[PDB]
Structures are given as structure tokens and as C-alpha cells.
Amino acid sequence: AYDNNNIFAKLIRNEIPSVRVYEDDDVIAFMDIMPQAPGHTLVIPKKGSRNLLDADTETLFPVIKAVQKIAKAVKKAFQADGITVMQFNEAASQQTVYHLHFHIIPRMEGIELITPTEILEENAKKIRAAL
């Protein structure tokens, strides 16, 4: 079952800080604190589910719209050669936080796949500008 005490639910409730790049009625986009590349952004629904498998289908539309919007902005902000989108379901797919989240990771030609808040904030400003 979905556990309302998970770290991303706490984030939604402003219980912990985040470095946000986009927010609306349905979603929050914010910097991964363990980025796989500079500008690595996560998108979450405000409505909680463990992952893709238990999400209400109607929840997925605003989520995927925002993933697209963020992919475009991240690419433009860092002049990335590519964007990798990932979404993990369960331990065997290396899911660690049990609240649905999509990864948007910028990619550079020839580069194969814990960061202080000030650096994530520098990176977020760039993404915000490119929206």
C-alpha cells in the first residue's frame, strides 16, 4: 500500500525543502539531489501512488505533459545532445522512493550515465528560464 509518510509526500506538504523548477495544480518538477548529470530533474504527481502500476490513469496525463515540458526545457537550458526519461517500478527496477516519479536526465555525446543545494539552485534557474 501507498505510504503517505514517504519523502516525496513530505516534499509535497512542504515538510522538507526542494529546489523546484515547475509547479501546477497536478505536479511538481524539482532537482534530483543525487543527479546523474547536471540538470537531472524529477517530475511527480501531487496525487500519491507508489509508482506507475497503482496510479489513477487520469493522474498520468498531467504528469506526462509536464515530463515533456521539462524535457524540452532541460535540453534547452544545458544545450544537451539528448534527454533520457526513466520511470522505475519496484525494487527490482531500482525504485527506492515509493511515490511515482519520472526522471529527466540530460545527455551529452560520448558521456555514459550527492549535490549541494546551491549548485542545484544554479541549475534550476537555467531550467526555469528555458520554460
Place this chain on the structure above:
Amino acid sequence: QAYDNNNIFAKLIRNEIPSVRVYEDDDVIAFMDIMPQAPGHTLVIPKKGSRNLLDADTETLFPVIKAVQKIAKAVKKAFQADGITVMQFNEAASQQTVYHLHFHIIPRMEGIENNIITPTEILEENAKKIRAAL
């Protein structure tokens, strides 16, 4: 860059090459990956052409993501998978290999971490399992 109407997924959509399809509606096709990273590895594509996520119509993404969820669930049941990895690649630097929008749906097994084609008959046996799990 211009969309390539001769890309192999556009050709699949127009019925110019065969596929092992597991699901289809007015907007999408789900079909077996012929070089799977795990047995049951399925691809979901829009029937409406775009190179990737970045140039897709936002409206197209709705039926795509619905079908990605539907397939993620069917694949996990059909293969009693421990997990499901969804991936979507944009551009060469993200290792996108066919320049038509596609989501990968990959079953994972606990503690189980190419250009080898899987014979069509084997993809079919895997398709049937997925088709029954929908």
C-alpha cells in the same frame, strides 16, 4: 531535423514490415521488441509520427502513457516480474536507435541485471502471455 518517414516504426505502422503486436487502439501499437533486454520486453508507439518526446503533440502523449501503464501491468503479470522499468530515449546521445517515439516496457527480476534477434515464433509465445494478461 526532419522526421524520417522511412524509419522502421513508421514502416510498421503503415503495414510495410511485420510485427508481433500485443495491443492496439486508434492511437497506439504495442509490440514485442525483437532484441529484448529481458523476455517480454515490449515497445509502445504512437501511430501519429514524431521523432521522439520533444516534438510529439501533447495530446498524443495521453493515449501513449495510458497504454504504457496498461502494458506495464500486463507484462508484470504475464511474466510474474519483480519489477518494471520504463524508458524513453531522445536523440543519439540518449541511445535512441529508431527515430520514432517509443517507450520501452521491461520486466525485471530481482538480482538479474544487444543485436541478437529473438526468433519470431518465440516473440509470439511471449505476446500470447501478455495478450492474456491484459
